[PDB]
Amino acid sequence: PEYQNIFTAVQVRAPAYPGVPLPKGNLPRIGRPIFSYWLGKIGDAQIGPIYLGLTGTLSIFFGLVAISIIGFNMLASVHWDVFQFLKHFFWLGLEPPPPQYGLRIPPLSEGGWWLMAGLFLTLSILLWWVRTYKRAEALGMSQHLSWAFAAAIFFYLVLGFIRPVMMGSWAKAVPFGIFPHLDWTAAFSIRYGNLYYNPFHMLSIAFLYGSALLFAMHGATILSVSRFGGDREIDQITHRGTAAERAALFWRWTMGFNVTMESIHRWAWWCAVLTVITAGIGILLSGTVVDNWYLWAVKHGMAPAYPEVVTAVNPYETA
Amino acid sequence: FTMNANLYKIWLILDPRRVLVSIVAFQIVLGLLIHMIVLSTDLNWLDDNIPVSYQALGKK
Amino acid sequence: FTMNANLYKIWLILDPRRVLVSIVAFQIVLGLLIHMIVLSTDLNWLDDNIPVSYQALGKK
Amino acid sequence: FTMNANLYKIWLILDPRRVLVSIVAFQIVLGLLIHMIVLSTDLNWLDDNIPVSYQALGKK
Amino acid sequence: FTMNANLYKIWLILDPRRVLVSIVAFQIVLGLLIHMIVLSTDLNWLDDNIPVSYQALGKK
Amino acid sequence: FTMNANLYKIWLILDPRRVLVSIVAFQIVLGLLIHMIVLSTDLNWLDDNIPVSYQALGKK
Amino acid sequence: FTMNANLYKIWLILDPRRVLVSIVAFQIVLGLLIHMIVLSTDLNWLDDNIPVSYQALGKK
Amino acid sequence: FTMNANLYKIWLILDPRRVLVSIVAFQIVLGLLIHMIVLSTDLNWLDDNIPVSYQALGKK
Amino acid sequence: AMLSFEKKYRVRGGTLIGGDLFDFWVGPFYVGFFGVVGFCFTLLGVLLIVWGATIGPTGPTSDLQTYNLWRISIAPPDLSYGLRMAPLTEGGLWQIITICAAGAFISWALREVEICRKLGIGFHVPFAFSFAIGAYLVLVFVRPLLMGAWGHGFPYGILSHLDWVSNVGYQFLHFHYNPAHMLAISFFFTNCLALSMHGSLILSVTNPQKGEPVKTSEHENTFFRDIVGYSIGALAIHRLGLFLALSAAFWSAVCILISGPFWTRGWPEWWNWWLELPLW
Amino acid sequence: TGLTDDEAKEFHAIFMQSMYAWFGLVVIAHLLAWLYRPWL
Amino acid sequence: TGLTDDEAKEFHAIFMQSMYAWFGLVVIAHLLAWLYRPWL
Amino acid sequence: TGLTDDEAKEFHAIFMQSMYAWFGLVVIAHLLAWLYRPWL
Amino acid sequence: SAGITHYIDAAQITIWAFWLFFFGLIIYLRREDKREGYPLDSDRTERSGGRVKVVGFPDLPDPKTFVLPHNGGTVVAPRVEAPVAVNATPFSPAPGSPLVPNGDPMLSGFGPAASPDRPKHCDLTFEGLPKIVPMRVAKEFSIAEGDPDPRGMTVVGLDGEVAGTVSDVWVDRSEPQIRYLEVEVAANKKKVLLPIGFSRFDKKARKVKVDAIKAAHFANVPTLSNPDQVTLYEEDKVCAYYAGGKLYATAERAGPLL
Numbered sequence A: 001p002e003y004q005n006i007f008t009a010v011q012v013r014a015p016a017y018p019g020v021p022l023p024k025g026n027l028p029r030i031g032r033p034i035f036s037y038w039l040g041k042i043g044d045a046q047i048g049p050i051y052l053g054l055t056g057t058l059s060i061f062f063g064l065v066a067i068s069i070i071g072f073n074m075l076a077s078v079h080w081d082v083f084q085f086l087k088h089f090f091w092l093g094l095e096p097p098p099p100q101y102g103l104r105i106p107p108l109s110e111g112g113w114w115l116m117a118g119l120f121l122t123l124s125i126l127l128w129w130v131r132t133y134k135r136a137e138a139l140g141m142s143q144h145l146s147w148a149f150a151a152a153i154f155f156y157l158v159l160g161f162i163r164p165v166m167m168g169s170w171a172k173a174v175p176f177g178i179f180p181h182l183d184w185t186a187a188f189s190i191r192y193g194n195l196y197y198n199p200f201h202m203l204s205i206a207f208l209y210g211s212a213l214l215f216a217m218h219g220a221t222i223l224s225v226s227r228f229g230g231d232r233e234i235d236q237i238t239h240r241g242t243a244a245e246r247a248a249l250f251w252r253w254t255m256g257f258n259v260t261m262e263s264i265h266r267w268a269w270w271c272a273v274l275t276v277i278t279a280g281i282g283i284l285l286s287g288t289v290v291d292n293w294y295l296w297a298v299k300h301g302m303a304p305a306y307p308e309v310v311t312a313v314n315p316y317e318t319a
Numbered sequence B, C, D, E, F, G, H: 001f002t003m004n005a006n007l008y009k010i011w012l013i014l015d016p017r018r019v020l021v022s023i024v025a026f027q028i029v030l031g032l033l034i035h036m037i038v039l040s041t042d043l044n045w046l047d048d049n050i051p052v053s054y055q056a057l058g059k060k
Numbered sequence I: 001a002m003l004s005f006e007k008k009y010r011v012r013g014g015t016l017i018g019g020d021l022f023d024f025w026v027g028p029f030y031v032g033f034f035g036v037v038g039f040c041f042t043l044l045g046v047l048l049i050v051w052g053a054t055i056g057p058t059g060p061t062s063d064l065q066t067y068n069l070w071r072i073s074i075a076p077p078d079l080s081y082g083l084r085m086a087p088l089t090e091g092g093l094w095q096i097i098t099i100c101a102a103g104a105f106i107s108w109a110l111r112e113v114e115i116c117r118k119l120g121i122g123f124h125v126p127f128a129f130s131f132a133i134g135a136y137l138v139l140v141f142v143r144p145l146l147m148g149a150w151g152h153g154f155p156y157g158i159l160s161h162l163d164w165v166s167n168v169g170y171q172f173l174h175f176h177y178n179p180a181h182m183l184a185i186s187f188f189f190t191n192c193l194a195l196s197m198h199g200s201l202i203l204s205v206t207n208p209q210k211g212e213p214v215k216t217s218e219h220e221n222t223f224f225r226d227i228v229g230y231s232i233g234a235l236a237i238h239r240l241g242l243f244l245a246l247s248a249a250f251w252s253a254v255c256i257l258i259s260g261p262f263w264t265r266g267w268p269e270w271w272n273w274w275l276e277l278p279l280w
Numbered sequence J, K, L: 001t002g003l004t005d006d007e008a009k010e011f012h013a014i015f016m017q018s019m020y021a022w023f024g025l026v027v028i029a030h031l032l033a034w035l036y037r038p039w040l
Numbered sequence M: 001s002a003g004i005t006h007y008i009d010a011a012q013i014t015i016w017a018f019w020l021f022f023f024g025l026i027i028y029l030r031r032e033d034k035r036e037g038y039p040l041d042s043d044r045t046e047r048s049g050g051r052v053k054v055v056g057f058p059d060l061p062d063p064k065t066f067v068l069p070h071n072g073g074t075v076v077a078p079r080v081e082a083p084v085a086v087n088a089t090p091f092s093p094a095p096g097s098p099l100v101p102n103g104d105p106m107l108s109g110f111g112p113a114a115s116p117d118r119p120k121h122c123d124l125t126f127e128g129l130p131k132i133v134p135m136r137v138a139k140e141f142s143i144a145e146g147d148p149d150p151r152g153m154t155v156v157g158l159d160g161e162v163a164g165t166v167s168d169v170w171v172d173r174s175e176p177q178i179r180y181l182e183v184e185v186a187a188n189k190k191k192v193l194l195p196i197g198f199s200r201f202d203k204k205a206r207k208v209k210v211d212a213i214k215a216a217h218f219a220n221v222p223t224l225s226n227p228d229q230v231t232l233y234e235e236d237k238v239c240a241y242y243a244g245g246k247l248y249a250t251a252e253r254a255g256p257l258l
């Protein structure tokens, strides 16, 4: 346990905290809290209780159907031979409906199960979003999490709702497969002229990167200032403290400007939530609005120019 | 437009500037949004038919 | 300009320098945003039409 | 200057130095930005034509 | 100096140091900018014409 | 020493050690910057010709 | 020792421990940065003249 | 080693572990930083010629 | 110019090299030894990067030489020179400029170091920033070195360095199958999943519903305990994050390094070791 | 703000007037162009 | 700010002799260049 | 700083001599070089 | 992004739509970034930026209103805070230059040791009890089954010499964890609190290593008003004292290494 506020050297335990009182109508928490010395050596040790109401139960049950369907077909292709199942797991996956069905409901064989397990996974998330909304207002909390989770969901549906349907073919939808879905994103790009030139795709990376960047700063800074109680952000947001009182000066002296203990968390939010925002878009545009982002770039004089040390002929025009 | 009489009451729940500027914003976007959508397929009044092409004949 | 009398009170809800500079911005920005959006598509005055390629007519 | 006459009232809502320098900025940008855009595809005047005679000829 | 002789009372809001160096640094950033932009396309006094195109002549 | 006369007063504004070394920095970054930009295109005096043609006698 | 004249006074604004070791670091790198820039094209004494054909003569 | 006459004073303003191991580290890096570059250009003695019979001919 | 609470912190000392000399503040920034250093690299490189835009692929008079930020590019020298300095024109710029990158990045960290040394805060930030720099030291030094050519680096072109990422990527076919690469990716995603979660919660407890007080850590814990059961902890997240962030980069560094020096075949194939296992 | 209509107009004078010093020097600019290298 | 009128004078001189110093040094080498090998 | 005229003065010399001891030590460097191989 | 446009399409009609929202959001943020600190104090180095300005690109925002919980006051953001005090003199009349701590920098309360006057009250839990308290009050808290017990270990010091021994540790009701250590200084025989952040463990020799300040410095550590609860005011002024050590506990530390 090296102390750079990395691992809690000495842990202590108190009676299982059954969460704070909820409002009327909200079922009582369930689950006997557990304690883990190891886990707790990372952060908190106590576990649960967990809430589970209508939306919750309706969700945990819903999406649990999709997962089954998927894992089922997977173990199905392997001819129910677990041996080869745990072998080709990565490869195994529930493929979408063939283009010879458009959007029509295909038979369980040719793409059916996918669609089904899809809607069950589509609503499973939409429903889960409400589940979170019910956990916010029940605690007088705001909906910053729902707003974000929403954004993510946006891009999630772009991969099936808004784009595929806008294309008129369930073929342009990601498959239920660890590896095969990697090929999806692998093919999509190839199909649309290289996402490197797709504007939104870049903007989105700036976030996948920025995101990682900030937390690398914040998560760190808070620790570096964890000495002066820099982890207790809440009472810091209310009445500024010494932690946040030097915590900024650092950044200020280093990069010139800075933000407040609260402020930053707002940047982080928009630097992360905006990630998928530029995600669903960059994909909502591809296939529909644009078809070849390479020529699209050069069309606007984007694509860089390189000398010609290597070039190939074209047997088509020739022959 | 008779409703005008009992309509006043509305302001009693919606704040003065809360929904005031909330609209000044909805329009702004919706505006540029429309010209934008219209400019695409509906009718590219700017560079389509008339007088377009003059940027080529006598232009260059 | 009807009710222009009743419209003066507005300042009582919104502040003077709030909607003031807010206009300068939305406008000033819209300025460039316009010439630009038009700079291309309709009458790309800069490089579409005359005067005749200074480079070709002038140089040659 | 005619406008100035009564327009001196505006200096009670907008800071003198703020509006002064704030614009000193928008000027350099709006400026620097212009020669660029006009030097981008409009008639380049730098080396578009003459006197590029020695530019490309005098060398060899 | 029609104007400036009258506006001298302007250093009353813009302390010297503030805009003295503000303008100071800006000169170089621009100095190297233009100087360089010019060196870029307009002409390349380095090898563009004279004196002897050494890389091609000087070597031997 | 044309302007340097009344330029003595400048020292209150610009501090000693502060802008004293700041300059030492620019020069250095510059010094290289030049030799660099120059040694590239114009007359790559380094390895292009004489003296002794040690790069035309050895390599060849 | 021309500048040695009154340059003596400068040690008051410049600290020995610092300016001295500081230079050490800057000096050094600058040197290797040189060999580096020079050893590149000017003359790669290693393989350039003699007696550097150990591989071409040995490998074969 | 002229300077080394009065240089004795060096240690009065520098501590022992200071430049002691300091240079030590700078030697290792430059140390191997140099076999490095030297092993690439002129004589890739590491593999380029003799002796290459037992390895090369041994491979045939 | 200082913040309402700055003056009482601008203490003297805590410098690594020649501090007292450059020990001062220029605006909201700090200089010191490393302060001047980085700058000496900034303009010496930033300008060279511009000189590249000026000059161009072949020449300043060429039709290739452009100034479009998108098309701008500063590619390294051929793989012929390997570990040799190529003509400033034919790769030289990149080579030199890059040397300025390390001088900027590293120094920038070192500068942060003593900066923290003054605030008596933790050296977490810099140590964290190290990885980023380290990752760079891999995409230009480590990898190229084990590849025997500084030309293996990536072009310095806003969009130019994307192609270098596409080729080197496909150079191993479907680059999506890289173990380290995948792993790393997960982290980048987890991280973003963390931010979208952390930042959100804070704002959701310090700015609750209308007519509501500022919630306490008492809620935070319950909140995530009612949606998924467990709550990592206050600083825990600030730990977890920092972890993900670094881990994301670390595993990535490995990701590209292994690609080439430690593997020439196609990544998709590497996974075969799992297949050719005497179990199926 | 932070001043009455007294020094609010005085500044306005210098401000306004000089403001024309540009509208004019900027018109001579464009006009000087309209004569050298025209456009449309 | 940093000094008063006197000290401001004292430095303006001592350094001014140093600035040119570089400069003169500059021209002799900028010149020597022009003389030996002409650019343009 | 941290010193007075009298003090810093006695060390101005000592320093200066050395920088030249090297400024010279190096002149000999360029010296022997140009002799062996000549550049420009 | 080109100055002149000759191509128009939907893809690009949405891109700019973003940048506008971006250029706007970045401002929204900036505004918030000024709810703590600004306005600035001096003019050492005239605000640097592509476009100077009086106080940044975006005008300061409107004071937000924070309703603390029960039995609490109210906070506003931003807020007009009265000028602080500096117990240090300018190392030089030249702006930017640092300020030398007067007297013993270990307690000059400047820079590393400098801490703002936090509310002279105490943080509480959800119900209302002081959040952070000593185990001598936390009747429920116990050392994790297995993890070695701190209570009884001897707190060593920077120089190595022992400064005292732990008599108790302060746990946190709200967030289960150990935040402070009720240390019993040997010299003054007083009872000062020790922060985790600086508290290091050596379960082998039953110690709580501290590189912050010397064993002797543990003597005059910011005492606490009520030994049954730590005040936010003091709490922040506590662990801040240790910070000084991070830069004052030894002349060598502040001194350069090369």
Ligand code: BCL
Binding pocket: A201, A202, A203, A205, A206, A207, A209, A210, A211, A213, I046, I136, I139, I154, I158, I159, I161, I162, I165
């Ligand atoms: C990591 C694997 C590849 C790589 C793969 C990609 C991919 C894939 C993408 C980028 C993208 C970007 N990359 Mg890259 N990139 C690499 C290494 C680098 C290095 C480097 C020093 O090593 C730099 C400076 C950049 C810089 C950049 C940005 C231009 C652009 C925005 C990313 C982002 O938002 O991050 C988060 C951080 C921030 C927003 C804050 C700071 C970043 C700023 C905005 C970028 C300034 C760069 C500037 C032009 C350099 C010259 C500075 C001079 C002083 C003017 N890349 C390596 C070789 N990079 C994205 C893009 O759109 O490219 C066009 C993108 O999609």
Ligand code: BCL
Binding pocket: D020, D024, D025, D027, D028, D030, D031, D032, D035, D038, D045, D046, E010, E019, E020, E023, E034, J018, J022, J025, J026, J029, J030, J033
């Ligand atoms: C394209 C056709 C023409 C051409 C047409 C024009 C036109 C038309 C205009 C210019 C203008 C300018 N051109 Mg031209 N120009 C050409 C080719 C060039 C080339 C070139 C290398 O080829 C260069 C380097 C320039 C350079 C310049 C600049 C000198 C000038 C910038 C104006 C500006 O926006 O300031 C930005 C302004 C500010 C930051 C400040 C605002 C000014 C105020 C009134 C003064 C400040 C008051 C202050 C508060 C008092 C304190 C004093 C100090 C600040 C401390 N041109 C070609 C030949 N050019 C502009 C100009 O000269 O205006 C006079 C202009 O209108």
Ligand code: BCL
Binding pocket: G020, G021, G023, G024, G025, G027, G028, G029, G030, G031, G032, G035, G038, G039, G045, H010, H019, H023, L018, L019, L022, L025, L026, L029, L030, L033
């Ligand atoms: C390219 C044409 C020539 C050539 C031309 C030159 C020229 C011209 C020069 C060199 C110089 C050098 N060359 Mg050569 N060189 C060639 C080929 C080589 C090869 C090779 C393998 O082929 C090598 C390894 C070298 C190696 C070297 C270095 C020994 C030396 C760089 C010194 C330096 O930068 O100090 C950097 C400085 C410092 C660290 C500090 C400042 C020095 C002060 C005076 C002493 C320190 C004082 C301190 C405060 C007191 C404490 C003492 C200790 C630090 C504790 N050359 C070819 C043949 N070379 C330089 C030289 O020889 O200088 C004597 C030089 O001017």
Ligand code: BCL
Binding pocket: G027, G028, G029, G030, G031, G032, G034, G035, G038, G042, L022, L023, L026, L027, L030, L033, L034, L039
């Ligand atoms: C083929 C050999 C290479 C070469 C290889 C190396 C190598 C290798 C090294 C150097 C090093 C140095 N070289 Mg050399 N150098 C060459 C050509 C030059 C030229 C030139 C105009 O052609 C110049 C100005 C320099 C200058 C320098 C210095 C920056 C540096 C010694 C630093 C120092 O102590 O400064 C003190 C200086 C001053 C206070 C300023 C006053 C200057 C006055 C006017 C005296 C200048 C006279 C000059 C030295 C003689 C030139 C002779 C001409 C050929 C006739 N070299 C040729 C092209 N040079 C070393 C280095 O930089 O270490 C850090 C090093 O290691």
Ligand code: BCL
Binding pocket: A185, I105, I132, I133, I135, I136, I139, I164, I165, I166, I167, I168, I169, I170, I174, I175, I176, I181, I184, I185, I188, I248, I249, I252, I253, I254, I255, I256, I257
């Ligand atoms: C055909 C193309 C291949 C492919 C080929 C490659 C190749 C080839 C590489 C990657 C690399 C990476 N790829 Mg891949 N990749 C593909 C598809 C993907 C997908 C996807 C969803 O499809 C994802 C998420 C990724 C994800 C990733 C990252 C894990 C990794 C970049 C790591 C990093 O953190 O560098 C962290 C950052 C840096 C190195 C830069 C250092 C930052 C410096 C220090 C700061 C700059 C400051 C600047 C100067 C200042 C700016 C401010 C201005 C002044 C204003 N790839 C496809 C299949 N990928 C790279 C990698 O593995 O790196 C380890 C790599 O080399």
Ligand code: BCL
Binding pocket: F024, F025, F027, F028, F030, F031, F032, F035, F038, F039, F045, G010, G014, G019, G020, G023, G034, G038, K018, K021, K022, K025, K026, K027, K029, K030, K031, K033, L040
């Ligand atoms: C390109 C055509 C020519 C050529 C033409 C020129 C010309 C023309 C010039 C140079 C100049 C220089 N050339 Mg040459 N040069 C050539 C080839 C070379 C080669 C080479 C390997 O081939 C090298 C290594 C050099 C190297 C150098 C540098 C020694 C020198 C840059 C000085 C400078 O900017 O300081 C930057 C400045 C500073 C760091 C500080 C400011 C100086 C002040 C006055 C002193 C500091 C005061 C301080 C406060 C007191 C404390 C002291 C210590 C810091 C503690 N040249 C070719 C052959 N070169 C310049 C020169 O030598 O001027 C004399 C110059 O004008």
Ligand SMILES: CC[C@H]1c2cc3[nH]c4c(c3C)C(=O)[C@H](C(=O)OC)c4c3nc(cc4[nH]c(cc(n2)[C@@H]1C)c(C(C)=O)c4C)[C@@H](C)[C@@H]3CCC(=O)OC/C=C(\C)CCC[C@H](C)CCC[C@H](C)CCCC(C)C
Binding pocket: A209, A210, A212, A213, A216, A217, A220, A251, A254, A255, I041, I042, I043, I044, I045, I046, I049, I097, I098, I100, I101, I104, I105, I108, I109, I112, I125, I126, I128, I129, I130, I131, I132, I155, I156, I157, I158, I161, I245, I246, I247, I248, I249, I250
């Ligand atoms: C695991 C580490 C994570 C991370 C952490 C991290 N980054 C950091 C820090 C930390 C802890 C800082 O403290 C530092 C910072 O912002 O300090 C205020 C920083 C930083 N992270 C940055 C960028 C960045 N980080 C990235 C990633 C990450 N940062 C990781 C997720 C990425 C990418 C590619 O995803 C980028 C782009 C900077 C904003 C900043 C460091 C700024 C700095 O030190 O700049 C120094 C140099 C200059 C300003 C001048 C450079 C000019 C040179 C002479 C030329 C160099 C040429 C260059 C290589 C070409 C690039 C061209 C490309 C456009 C193709």
Ligand SMILES: CC(C)=CCC/C(C)=C/CC/C(C)=C/CC/C(C)=C/CC/C(C)=C/CC/C(C)=C/CC/C(C)=C/CC/C(C)=C/CC1=C(C)C(=O)c2ccccc2C1=O
Binding pocket: A210, A213, A214, A217, A218, A219, A221, A222, A244, A247, A248, A251, A252, A255, A256, A257, A258, A259, A260, A261, A264, A267, D029, D032, D033, M049, M050, M051
């Ligand atoms: C074509 C054309 C016309 C061009 C015109 C060109 C013109 C006019 C140029 C003139 C203008 C010029 C030269 C401008 C130069 C500006 C320069 C050089 C700025 C340099 C500064 C610089 C490189 C900054 C990098 C900032 C970056 C990229 C940061 C990335 C991370 C990020 C999103 C930061 C924003 C939020 C902040 C400040 C986070 C830091 C931060 C973190 C991470 C905490 O954890 C924390 C905890 C508690 C309190 C505060 C903080 C805190 O501030």
Ligand SMILES: COC(C)(C)C/C=C/C(C)=C/C=C/C(C)=C/C=C/C(C)=C/C=C/C=C(C)/C=C/C=C(C)/C=C/C=C(C)/C=C/CC(C)(C)OC
Binding pocket: F028, F031, F032, F033, F035, F036, G020, G023, G034, G037, H006, H007, H008, H009, H010, H012, L011, L014, L015, L016, L018, L019, L020, L022
């Ligand atoms: C009792 O008191 C006692 C005696 C004990 C006190 C004792 C005191 C002691 C022992 C003091 C010792 C003092 C010492 C050793 C002082 C030493 C001073 C020295 C050595 C100073 C040296 C200075 C060197 C300088 C400033 C060199 C400057 C070089 C410059 C600026 C070079 C610029 C080069 C350029 C731009 C090169 C460009 C090359 C190209 C063109 C290739 O770059 C692209």
Ligand SMILES: COC(C)(C)C/C=C/C(C)=C/C=C/C(C)=C/C=C/C(C)=C/C=C\C=C(C)\C=C\C=C(C)\C=C\C=C(C)\C=C\CC(C)(C)OC
Binding pocket: A067, A068, A070, A071, A072, A075, A115, A118, A119, A122, A156, A157, A158, A159, A160, A161, A173, A174, A175, A176, A177, A178, A179, A181
């Ligand atoms: C047998 O299994 C047991 C019991 C042992 C349980 C084990 C299960 C296991 C091991 C499961 C493993 C599952 C795995 C590995 C799944 C991996 C999935 C992956 C990698 C998925 C990747 C991407 C998926 C995407 C992008 C899915 C998108 C889905 C969408 C957009 C669905 C949209 C559905 C819609 C719009 C439905 C609309 C309703 C209708 C069709 C009626 O509208 C007309």
Ligand SMILES: [Ca+2]
Binding pocket: A175, A180, A183, A184
């Ligand atoms: Ca597939």
Ligand SMILES: [Ca+2]
Binding pocket: B059, C044, C045, C046, C047, C048, C049, C050, C051, J039, J040
């Ligand atoms: Ca026209």
Ligand SMILES: [Ca+2]
Binding pocket: E044, E045, E046, E047, E048, E049, E050, E051, K039, K040
């Ligand atoms: Ca010429």
Ligand SMILES: [Ca+2]
Binding pocket: F044, F045, F046, F047, F048, F049, F050, F051, L039, L040
């Ligand atoms: Ca030559």
Ligand SMILES: [Fe+3]
Binding pocket: A218, A222, A233, A265, I198, I202, I238
């Ligand atoms: Fe946080």
